[PDB]
Design a protein around this ligand. Sequence first.
Ligand SMILES: [Zn+2]
Ligand SMILES: [Zn+2]
Length: 650
Amino acid sequence: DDVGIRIENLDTTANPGTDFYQYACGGWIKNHPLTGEYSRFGSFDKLSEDNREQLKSLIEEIAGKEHEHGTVAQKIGDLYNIAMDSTKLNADGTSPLKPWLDKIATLNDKAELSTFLAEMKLSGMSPFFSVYVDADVMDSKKNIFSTYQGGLSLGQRDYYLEEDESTMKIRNEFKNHVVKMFELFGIPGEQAQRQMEDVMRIETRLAKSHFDKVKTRDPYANYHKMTVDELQKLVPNIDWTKFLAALNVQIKELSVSQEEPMVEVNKLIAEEPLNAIRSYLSWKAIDHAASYLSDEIYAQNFEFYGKVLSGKTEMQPRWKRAQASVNDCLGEAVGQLYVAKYFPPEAKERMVNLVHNLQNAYAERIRNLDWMGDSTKAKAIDKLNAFYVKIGYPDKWKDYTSLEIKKDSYFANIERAVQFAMREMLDKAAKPVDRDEWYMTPQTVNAYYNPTTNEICFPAGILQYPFFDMNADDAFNYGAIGVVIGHEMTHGFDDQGRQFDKDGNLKDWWTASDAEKFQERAKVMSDFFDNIEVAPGVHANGKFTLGETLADYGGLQISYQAFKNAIAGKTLENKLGFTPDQRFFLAYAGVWAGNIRDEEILRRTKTDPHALGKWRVDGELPHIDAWYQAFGITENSPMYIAKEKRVTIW
Ligand SMILES: [Zn+2]
Ligand SMILES: [Zn+2]
């Protein structure tokens, strides 16, 4: 297989035992100058850019030909092309929303809102409040239906309430925007004024009852478990039995994440006349549809949300917005065709085998730890073997048969796609948590171990050069993606992972001895990084970055051990003059190749819990015995530290 590493990345005037990062990556630095718009640019950023061009080219290629009706290619291509057919969008005008606006006008009984609000939810609107289904934070093996404060067009309560002149301007821009939009939908000016006032009055009352975003982030405090009939007593002006039946949700209990905003919804429904409620629901429909109709309507939408609210100066071209629609609403379907082009089953199979080899090597190292007692070692190995390994793309793909894409209107297709997604989410309320369902799409360039689910997810999007190259040999791939995955693996077992059992439920399974001895070993690493000068007269924060430096250490030892196991009994061949062991460490360094501005070095030192790319290499390898052997590092090397001073935590 290919060597994977590239001479253009090296700076071979550097001494490996003096600045290994410079040796392995100095050429990359020289060949990738910062453009001006970025403070940091590394090989992760280069991959993210490469990946967005892959999706653009993929979707255009799919859309350039006709496909068999009902295939994911036909759904992708047709949705893209109907999003792009601006002559039809402009000829159709607002007519695709007429069924919704007519339906809202027939509301004649506040009791009908119970079913109607659920119907709007299924089409992707959230008047008054939001609902969602996800793993119960008190019982990770079960799902729970939750309500959440919502109903605001501006999203944040402060826009409706702060009296400074800057926020007042935003409010008055919103008022003008709502009137202009109603008028674009054929509402006469006098009625558009009156309906805008209804919208502002209602959303301002909702906003007053909301909590700040700071207070809503804790899912354990933003949790109120109760029966359906108890919610029926808390918010009597919605028939929750009908609301839930219209959502096809069959449950006995649910969570009201914030009760006060829900009580305010109850009061709003009681106190506002039905015609003002119709104004608000009509606005929710228009505001949701505003991106999917004519250019005039999109332009007005952008004038407010883009120019006023976001400080943007120019709208994105239609093709970029059409690609976002396809990627955001047919994400996993795009994933199927993405991996068919870029990440074949043999690549998935190689990576799944690699992850299993890392698991086996990690289990071997856990047995030899000198800070973990025997009972804790057994619990750790059992938790590790119970990892949910989600690599490349799903074993269980979403079934898209019930999602129909056809040439009626852009808006009608978006609506069917949202209905499909909402149905799939709400169906989970009745079922136990299914950890084979992917929350990320295959084309995403992100990866993590999740402590609350005990799953490790590495999508095809990140499994590309310089992390993983199907064409490269094991030295390259273990040194690069292998270390990255092993690093994530240690988060099931470190100071964070020890708070969760193998089901993702809260349980502290370390003994007091485990905790004391772990900190004893960890202090070796934090002291070491404390003494690194990341800039003249500026030291690293060894305690703040400890979670990440211990994990890189672990990933290095885990992947190197798995690598030596995988190549056991095979012929070593040097490539580019490097032994396989040397290539392992050169590939590792390349994962962290990067260019960073001087001021960006200072700020990341203040704020970033990850060590800088350079010290993720130069501060980690002096703790790895195998690196000394691979590059002949001796007592006379500036990076050398004595065996008895090296970290031993994994
Ligand atoms: Zn090899
Ligand atoms: Zn980490």
